[PDB]
Amino acid sequence: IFELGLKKYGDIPEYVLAYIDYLSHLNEDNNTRVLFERVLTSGSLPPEKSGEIWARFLAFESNIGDLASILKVEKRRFTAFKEEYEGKETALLVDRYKFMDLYPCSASELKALGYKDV
Amino acid sequence: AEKKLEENPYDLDAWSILIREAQNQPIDKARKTYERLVAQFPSSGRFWKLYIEAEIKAKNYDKVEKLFQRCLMKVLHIDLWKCYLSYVRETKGKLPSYKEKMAQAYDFALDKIGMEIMSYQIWVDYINFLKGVEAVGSYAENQRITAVRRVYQRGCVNPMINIEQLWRDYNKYEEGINIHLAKKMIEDRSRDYMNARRVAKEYETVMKGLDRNAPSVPPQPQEAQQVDMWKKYIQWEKSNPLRTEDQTLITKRVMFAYEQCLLVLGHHPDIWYEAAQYLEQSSKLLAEKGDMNNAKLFSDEAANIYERAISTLLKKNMLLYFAYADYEESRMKYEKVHSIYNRLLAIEDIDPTLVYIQYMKFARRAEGIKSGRMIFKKAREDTRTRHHVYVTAALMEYYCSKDKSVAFKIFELGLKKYGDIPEYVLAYIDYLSHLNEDNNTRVLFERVLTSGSLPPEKSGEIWARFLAFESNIGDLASILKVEKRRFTAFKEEYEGKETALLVDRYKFMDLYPCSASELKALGYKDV
Amino acid sequence: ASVQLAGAKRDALLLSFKDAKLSVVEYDPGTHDLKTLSLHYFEEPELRDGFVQNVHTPRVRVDPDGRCAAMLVYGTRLVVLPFRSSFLPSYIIDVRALDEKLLNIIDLQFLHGYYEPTLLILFEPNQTWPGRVAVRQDTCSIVAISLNITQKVHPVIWSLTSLPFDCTQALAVPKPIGGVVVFAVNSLLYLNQSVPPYGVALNSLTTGTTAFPLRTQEGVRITLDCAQATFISYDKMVISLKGGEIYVLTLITDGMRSVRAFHFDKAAASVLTTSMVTMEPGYLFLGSRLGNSLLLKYTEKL
């Protein structure tokens, strides 16, 4: 049923994230990662509206996978979003290290680094 | 002035009053004032110089040298390197080996600070010193001619203010010893000078806007506007005005741009992070094009710039540790990493709850599951630890080691200890909400909401995930029990808000059964 | 390679001929000959990228579940044959237009487990020669590409990137343990997606030639450069070395189905092989060009 919708509605970011966190919870690393590279390469979704798709990507590659896999992506995700992330790299780094409300800096420091909360 | 230091420890008006009253007191009393200044501002070479000029006023020549052994390597400020050469000129001047010692002092400065734009007089003071060195004969005179020529040819490549005057003195030195051969020696290095003279005019623009004298202050208007002028100066030197393929000439100029920025804004993690990531980038870029011995030179320099952050200025700042932890995992020096992580744990007032997550996230990733649980053993025995490492560890076992029971036993271990934190329980609520057993997740819900381990007043989002679960599964008889029971538990603050509370039985992700204008007056809220 | 197609009563054969000709054949009853099922000619001059002198041989591998099969045409062009007529139209994945810039393939295998045909691919993106290891220490790598058949994409899930410089053939370890063993000349690795790397060294020529973390295999001093291997049902691999010496590698397994240590035993010597086959359980075949390729028989000792 989810693959039936993805063929028809693969350009809606609010749809895909609801299928991203479903497959994020079924305990399979390969399936979850296979879906992520489907959405972010096939061009069915516009890349400009896929910021939260990439944001759930590093939430997944930080629980599983190795550090070699993460550093590929944050070079690749920064390549896909080169226009709006130049100068914001260290504030973008916090989303590799943050948990639910744990940030590695104070709220006063993240105000001037350019950090945003999705 | 000390009262103003209590609220703002970096109140520069309050620090300046300590500087104003520093010369109105002797060198024994002012010393306690400056040592509170230079240890608090380790990078401000203007603030280093005023105590060096104070100690040179009291003629404490042994103490001035200990100051040069303390701050000269860490502060690349141009007035500091002028004061270092003015000291050895005065103090060492009557020694018989002064000509060896002073000539070593100028060459030691030009290697590190000679690239700076106001370093022109540092060039000229060694030109006149080599002429001042007495040489008799013909071979020793040609030893003088060789030594003066080498500093000429090096200095006329370096972009700075008075580069038009050094070449003018170069033309008169070549013609001053031999007019005939001066026409060739000037001409042979003239084209590289025209590149050096042009980029020096290009270097004026980004440097005339900078301050280069502000104390190092963490971010709190003008300060962020200064950062933009630093990020312009970093990326303009990344744009390679001296267009070349030699990454070693590219990086060390960007490294000189990094060191000047760390003096002014050293309490900023991004300037430390964008420093060594450029070195990590320059490590793998030199690893491709043959230069292998210099690839590890910048790679250990990448660990060095990370080391200067956690040791000198930013000791409690967690972010530069993990950048230095994950850099050493990328260099596969896994034994070094545990020293890095445990260095942070020795610091008294931090929150190790985040660090134990990442120090568990290293051990599973690099050393296996059993190495991860040894870290999680150390996470339980630390008093300062909060509930987030209990959430991570059960997810590290379930997502990676594919076990449900260990992921269940770790969560139940935390629920016995931390069952009064609502942010913990919701992280265990949505875990059991996704494992597909309606008997599992409903049993947990009635545990949390009846046993009294969690306070009922802070359990509003616990109940809000309840009706998200009893709407996907279960029957309508089960829901209407709960919204009579949840309203009974929250009787005080929900009377009058029932229909706005009803929307959370019917809403999906962004689908509400009314307009946003109607829900504004019903009392609807979004959690 | 061979694969039992959808509803077939026999097992087809994926042959591969020179300059990239695949040919799926079958035995036929009735006429006792063969029967060609499909002909795939890939000798297009735009599939070479100008390289006239074909040096790489076209290599046919099959997915052990029978989902697809992949030919490495010319070293740089994964031709995928999807399966279910019993067939689907092929397509040519470009290798050099993937991530990681693969560019010098050494071996490629279909790995076990999974839900999609994951294909491990050893390569050397910055190539070196044994004989030049002081400026190029260890450059072999792995990409386990995961073939989406229907959508025709391919996520490059799981990459390691500082394997020893002289790795010969890769080998897919079967389902109950999973992963891969990667024969290097002087070492032997066991790699997997959720497990850290574990690999031992088989002589002291791994000293100044490898930065990969290598233990010391006790009581073993050999090399693995032209060494054919097959797998016993689970956790036992028959390596015939160069020199015709059969070793039966035991992967010692923990309770969580992870490889802890290796265990060799010098078993008997035999033919200088070029291939290896497990037949009926307790029989092996040693296909060899140079030597009488013979049928063996192993038993358990008491």
What type of residue sits at position B220?
Answer: Q
**Quick one: DSSP state of residue B143?**
H
Q: Which two tokens stand for residue C173?
A: 């370890």
Q: Judge whether A71 is closer than 8 Å to chain C, CB to CB.
A: no
Q: Judge whether A79 is closer than 8 Å to chain C, CB to CB.
A: no
Residue C140 contacts residue C123 (beta carbons within 8 Å): yes
Four-residue CA torsion sign, C17, C22, C26, C30? negative
Residue C23: CB atoms within 10 A of its CB come to 16
Residue of chain B whose Cα is closest to the Cα of C256: B401
What are residue C231's DSSP bridge partners?
Answer: C237
For chain C, the domain total comes to: 1
Chain A residues with CB inside 8 Å of B400's CB? 63-64
| Block residue for tokens 């005019």 | B201
Measured distance CA(B282)–CA(B248) in Å, rounded: 8
Residue B17: CB atoms within 10 A of its CB come to 14
Chain C residues with CB inside 8 Å of A32's CB? none
DSSP B473-502: SS-HHHHHHHHHHHHHHTHHHHTT-HHHHH
Q: Which two tokens stand for residue B522?
A: 């019903």
Q: Which helix (H) or strand (E) holds B110?
A: helix B98-112
Topology of domain B190-527, CATH: 1.25.40
| Contact yes or no for C194 and B366 at CB 8 A | no
Measured distance CA(B97)–CA(B95) in Å, rounded: 5
Chain A residues with CB inside 8 Å of B358's CB? 97
Please give the resolution of this entry in Å, rounded to 1 decimal.
Answer: 3.6
DSSP B367-396: H-HHHHHHHHHHHHT-TT--THHHHHHHHH
Q: Which two tokens stand for residue B24?
A: 């109105």
| Block residue for tokens 């979850």 | A32
Interface of A with B in 41-60 (CB under 8 A): none
- Chain C interface disruption, residue of B371, B401, B403, most C CBs within 10 A: B401
| A34 burial type by CB count under 10 A (0-12 exposed, 13-18 middle, 19+ buried) | buried
| Contact yes or no for B368 and C256 at CB 8 A | no
| C68 burial type by CB count under 10 A (0-12 exposed, 13-18 middle, 19+ buried) | buried
Question: How was this one solved?
Answer: cryo-EM
Here the contacts of B36-41 (C-beta below 8 Å, separation 24 or greater) are B38/B71, B40/B9, B40/B10, B40/B15, B41/B15, B41/B215, B41/B216
Q: What is the CATH number of the domain that holds C242?
A: 2.130.10.10
Q: Which helix (H) or strand (E) holds C107?
A: strand C105-110
| B349 burial type by CB count under 10 A (0-12 exposed, 13-18 middle, 19+ buried) | exposed
Here the contacts of C44-48 (C-beta below 8 Å, separation 24 or greater) are C47/C20, C47/C73, C47/C74, C47/C77, C47/C92, C48/C74
Q: Which helix (H) or strand (E) holds B69?
A: helix B61-71
| Contact yes or no for A27 and B398 at CB 8 A | yes
Nearest to B230 by CA among A80, A112, A92, A96: A112
- Chain A interface disruption, residue of B334, B434, B441, most A CBs within 10 A: B434
What type of residue sits at position B297?
Answer: L
Nearest to C65 by CA among C149, C133, C12, C3: C3
Here the contacts of A16-22 (C-beta below 8 Å, separation 24 or greater) are A16/A45, A16/A53, A17/A52, A17/A53, A17/A56, A18/B509, A20/A53, A20/A56, A21/A56
* HEC secondary structure over A17-84: HHHHHHHCCCCCHHHHHHHHHHHCCCCCCCHHHCHHHHHHHHHHHHHCCCHHHHHHHHHHHHHHCHHH
Rounded to the nearest angstrom, the minimum Cα separation between C157 and chain B is 15
Domain that holds residue C190: 1-302
| B348 burial type by CB count under 10 A (0-12 exposed, 13-18 middle, 19+ buried) | exposed
Do B1-189 and B190-527 fold alike per CATH?
Answer: yes
Rounded to the nearest angstrom, the minimum Cα separation between B401 and chain C is 8
What are residue C190's DSSP bridge partners?
Answer: C181, C198
Measured distance CA(A51)–CA(B217) in Å, rounded: 33
| Contact yes or no for C135 and B290 at CB 8 A | yes
Q: Which two tokens stand for residue C202?
A: 């088989």
| Contact yes or no for C155 and A42 at CB 8 A | no
Residue C73 contacts residue C134 (beta carbons within 8 Å): no
Q: Judge whether A33 is closer than 8 Å to chain C, CB to CB.
A: yes
Q: Which two tokens stand for residue A32?
A: 């979850």
Measured distance CA(A98)–CA(A88) in Å, rounded: 16
| Contact yes or no for B388 and A25 at CB 8 A | no
| Contact yes or no for C195 and B368 at CB 8 A | yes
Chain B residues with CB inside 8 Å of A27's CB? 398-399, 402
Measured distance CA(B328)–CA(B323) in Å, rounded: 9
Measured distance CA(B197)–CA(B276) in Å, rounded: 30
| Block residue for tokens 């450029």 | B278
What are residue C239's DSSP bridge partners?
Answer: C229, C247
Domain boundaries, chain B: 1-189, 190-527
Name, in order, each residue with C-beta under 8 angstroms of C168's C-beta and a sequence gap of 6 or more: C106, C107, C183, C184, C185, C224, C225, C226, C227
| Block residue for tokens 């090399």 | C223
C180-184 and C187-191 strand pairing = antiparallel
Q: Which two tokens stand for residue B362?
A: 């290293």
Backbone dihedral angles phi then psi of residue B360, each to the nearest 5 degrees: -85, -30
Residue A41 contacts residue C97 (beta carbons within 8 Å): no
Rounded to the nearest angstrom, the minimum Cα separation between C153 and chain B is 25
| Contact yes or no for A99 and B354 at CB 8 A | yes
Instruction: Quote the distance between the C-alpha of residue B66 and its chain's center.
Output: 28
Residue C19 contacts residue C39 (beta carbons within 8 Å): no
Report the interhelical angle of B247-264 vs B295-308 (nearest 10°): 10
**Quick one: DSSP state of residue B312?**
I
Q: Judge whether B329 is closer than 8 Å to chain A, CB to CB.
A: yes
State whether CATH 3.20.20.150 applies to domain B1-189. Answer: no
Chain C residues with CB inside 8 Å of B292's CB? 135-136
| Contact yes or no for B332 and C213 at CB 8 A | yes
Nearest to B169 by CA among B118, B124, B231: B124
